[PDB]
Design an enzyme around this catalytic site. Structure first.
Site, PDB file in Angstrom:
ATOM      1  N   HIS A 125     -17.124  45.057  -6.969  1.00 18.56           N
ATOM      2  CA  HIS A 125     -15.722  45.419  -7.331  1.00 18.56           C
ATOM      3  C   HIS A 125     -15.696  46.246  -8.624  1.00 18.56           C
ATOM      4  O   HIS A 125     -16.435  45.918  -9.554  1.00 18.56           O
ATOM      5  CB  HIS A 125     -14.852  44.148  -7.404  1.00 18.56           C
ATOM      6  CG  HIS A 125     -13.421  44.455  -7.632  1.00 18.56           C
ATOM      7  ND1 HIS A 125     -12.877  44.524  -8.900  1.00 18.56           N
ATOM      8  CD2 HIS A 125     -12.429  44.760  -6.772  1.00 18.56           C
ATOM      9  CE1 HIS A 125     -11.602  44.849  -8.808  1.00 18.56           C
ATOM     10  NE2 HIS A 125     -11.306  44.991  -7.514  1.00 18.56           N
ATOM     11  N   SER A 159     -15.405  36.542   7.663  1.00 17.52           N
ATOM     12  CA  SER A 159     -14.604  37.587   6.976  1.00 17.52           C
ATOM     13  C   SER A 159     -13.269  37.815   7.700  1.00 17.52           C
ATOM     14  O   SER A 159     -13.176  37.601   8.927  1.00 17.52           O
ATOM     15  CB  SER A 159     -15.373  38.871   6.868  1.00 17.52           C
ATOM     16  OG  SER A 159     -14.560  39.896   6.335  1.00 17.52           O
TER      17      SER A 159
END
Lengths: 374, 374
Positions: free
Chosen positions: B120, B323
C-alpha cells in the site's frame, strides 16, 4: 445479534457519566461550549477525506469542499494568501506539529531541532519518530525559551540551518516564545531567514491571539514557516482534530516518492476524518470575528479574576499576557485529584475555557487552594 | 451569529449528495452497512482518549473502559493472551502500521524494512517519516511477495535483523504474503525468530480471515509480532479508525524519553478519538462470530459470482483465496470514472463490500466492462 442488556446498561451508564461530567474541565484547554447537533445525522455515511482536498477523489463520500473553506479561513486568519498556503484538517495538534517538523527536516536534513524545557511532551514522540537531530534549550521562569541559551547553543554547534520549535502557548505556563526576538537574534548571528525553519506549536493560543488587541508574533506576516492548532482546544470539538498551515513552496520542494511506491499526496496519514472538517466548518461559519473575541474577552477577564482572588490571599498566582492559563504552586494530592488538575515543576494551573459562563467552578477551585495553603 | 442561508444550503445540499451516494462504493474496501445511530448523542461531549487506556487520566470524558474491551476482543481474535498484548484504537490502518514499523525499528535500529511492489502507498509515507532503511522486493503475478527475491536480497545485504512488512490483503489484488513460508525460508538462512520482526498490514483482511474456514497465517499463533486493521474497511465506520495489536514485551523494551521531556505513554499521537472506540465497541458486541461469518460468506459468494460472470464472457478476472477483491484488466477512462474505480498495473478491481445485499450494482458494473471489451 443486537446489544445484550448488560452492554446496553454499560452504554447508558456512560451516558449518565458524560451528562454528569460534561463540564468537569477546569484544568485542561478543551472548551466544551460547542453545539454540532446539526451534524450528528452525517454519522450515517462512511465519509473519508483520504488524500489532498484540493485534488479529485473517486471516494465520493468526502467533505473536501468544506475542508477547502476551513483552510481558506485559516490562511486568512494567519495572514498567508490562500494560493501560497498548504495544509489540512488533521487528527490533532500532534499530527499538525509532526507535519511542521517533517517539512523542516526535509528542507534541512541535518538541521538541529531546538525546543525549550516547556515544550509539550508530544515533541519527544515527534523527535523519536522522525529520527531528527534535537537540542534542549533552557526556559525562563515565565516558561518562554531562554533566547540567550538558544543563540549560544546555535553558535556552539556551528548550526547553519536551525529548526526552531516555537511554543505559541506553553501547556503548563501559557508562555509565548517571541519569534520577532528569535529571528532578530539569529539574524545577528549571520544566518539568513531562507536558511532556517520556524514551526509554531499554537495548539491552544492559535485561536486566541487572532482575537486579541496586542498579539505576540505567531502568524505568516510575523515570519513563521508553518503552524499547528488543536480544533478541540479553544474552538471546541467532540472529536480531537487539528489544522496545519504551511508554505506551498516548502511542501512542493519535498518528495514523498519511495523506490517504485509513490504517495499521490503530501498528507502524513491515509484515510482522513471527513466529519471534523464539517465540525470546524460550522464552528468557523457560525462564529464571526466579534463572537470569537467576546468568548476570549470572557476567558481573559475570568483568568484576571482568578489571579486577583489568589493574589488578595497569600498565593503567588500569575498569568502571561493574552493567556487564559493561571499558574500557582502545586497544592496537596487531595486537591489536584478532586479538581482533575495537570501538575508539574511544583506548579499547577487552571484554564478559563469558554464553558465557564460564570466564575463559580473557578471560585470553588481557588477557595480549595486557599484552604489547602493553611 | 448562526449559519447564514447560503451556508445552511451548502450543508443541506451535501446531505442530499450523501443520501444519493451513501452506497456508491463498488471499488474500495469501506463497507457502508453500519448503524451507529445510538452513538450520535455522544457528539454532545468533548471526549478525548489522550494517553494509554490502561492507565488513569484526569481527562474524565474518555471511553477507556470501552477501548479496553475492544482490545480484549482483538487480542482474543488474533490469538494473543490479553496480558501479553499492547495496542489501541488508532486514527487508521496507516497509524497502526506506522506504530508496527516503529516498534520494529526501535528493536532493530539497523534492520532493513522489506516490502513487495504490491505494498500500500502508505508505506512510502511510513518509510520517509521514520528514516528507516528499506528494500523493495519483487511481486509474483498474484500480488504476493516474491519469496525467492526476498531471501536472495536478505543474504546479499548480509542483513542480520530483517523487518518484514507482510501484506495480509494487498490493496489492488487481495494477495496474502505467506508468513509460514517467509519464517521457514528465513529460518533456512540461519536467522533465529527472536532476531527479526514481522508486521502484518491486515487493513481489510484482518476482519476477513478470522471468520473463514481455511485462513492463511496472519495472527500471533502464526508468529506475527504486530498487526494493523482499518475499522472503516470490513467492519464499517462513519469515521476512519484502526486497531494495532503488538507484544507487550516489545513495547516495554522501547523508551520514548527525550532529553528532559518524557512521554507518559507509548502511543504515537496526543489527543485520541474517544468516539471510534465506542463505534468499534458496538460493532464487536452487536455482531457474534456467526454474524460476521455470514457477512463474509455473502461477500465471498458475490466475489465468486463476479469471477464466473466475467469468465463466462471473454474476460481474465480472478480473485485470490479468502479474498473479496475481483481483479480484471483496466477498461477505458469512461468506465473507471462512471463506476469510481481504483486502477493500476493495467488492472482494476471491484470489492464485494457488505452493503451489496444483492448482486445488481456488481452486475451493472460487469455488463459495462463487457460492453467496453468490444
Amino acid at each position: 445479534m443486537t446489544l445484550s442488556i448488560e452492554n446496553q446498561n454499560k452504554l447508558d451508564e456512560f451516558w449518565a457519566y458524560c451528562v454528569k461530567n460534561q463540564y468537569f474541565n477546569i484544568g485542561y484547554p478543551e472548551s466544551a461550549d460547542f453545539d454540532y447537533t446539526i451534524l450528528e445525522r452525517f454519522m450515517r455515511f462512511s465519509i473519508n477525506n483520504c488524500g489532498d482536498w484540493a485534488e479529485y477523489s473517486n471516494y465520493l463520500l468526502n467533505s473536501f469542499d468544506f475542508e477547502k473553506e476551513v483552510m481558506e479561513y485559516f490562511a486568512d486568519l494567519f495572514k498567508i494568501p490562500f494560493e501560497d498556503s498548504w495544509g489540512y484538517v488533521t487528527n490533532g495538534g500532534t499530527e499538525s506539529n509532526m507535519f511542521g517538523v517533517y517539512l523542516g527536516r526535509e528542507l534541512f536534513p541535518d538541521g538541529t531541532l531546538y525546543y525549550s524545557k516547556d515544550t509539550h511532551y508530544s515533541v519527544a514522540k515527534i523527535v523519536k519518530l522522525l529520527r531528527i537531530k534535537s537540542q534542549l534549550v533552557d526556559s525562563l521562569p515565565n516558561g518562554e525559551i531562554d533566547y540567550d541559551d538558544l543563540i549560544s547553543k546555535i553558535k556552539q554547534d556551528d548550526e547553519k540551518h536551525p529548526i526552531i520549535f516555537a511554543n505559541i502557548g506553553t501547556t503548563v505556563r501559557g508562555a509565548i516564545d517571541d519569534i520577532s526576538k528569535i529571528q532578530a537574534m539569529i539574524g545577528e548571528l549571520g544566518i539568513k531567514r531562507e536558511d532556517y525553519y520556524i514551526h509554531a506549536d499554537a495548539a491552544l493560543s492559535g485561536m486566541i491571539l487572532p482575537f486579541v488587541d496586542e498579539p505576540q508574533g505567531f502568524n505568516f506576516a510575523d515570519g513563521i514557516d508553518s503552524i499547528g492548532v488543536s480544533g478541540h482546544k479553544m474552538i471546541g470539538s467532540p472529536i480531537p482534530c487539528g489544522i496545519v498551515v504551511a508554505k506551498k513552496r516548502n511542501v512542493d520542494a519535498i518528495s514523498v516518492e519511495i523506490d517504485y511506491i509513490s504517495a499521490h499526496d503530501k498528507t502524513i496519514t491515509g484515510s482522513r476524518n471527513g466529519h471534523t472538517p464539517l465540525m470546524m466548518w460550522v464552528a468557523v461559519k457560525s462564529h464571526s470575528h466579534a463572537d470569537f473575541k467576546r468568548r476570549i474577552n470572557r476567558s481573559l477577564d475570568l483568568a484576571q479574576h482568578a489571579v486577583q482572588r489568589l493574589q488578595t490571599a497569600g498565593i503567588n498566582a500569575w498569568c502571561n499576557k493574552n493567556s487564559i492559563t493561571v499558574v500557582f504552586p502545586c497544592p496537596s494530592e487531595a486537591v489536584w485529584k478532586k479538581h482533575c488538575l495537570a501538575t508539574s515543576g511544583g506548579q499547577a494551573h487552571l484554564i478559563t475555557t469558554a464553558h465557564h459562563l460564570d466564575a463559580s467552578k473557578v471560585d470553588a477551585l481557588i477557595d480549595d487552594v486557599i484552604k489547602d495553603a493553611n
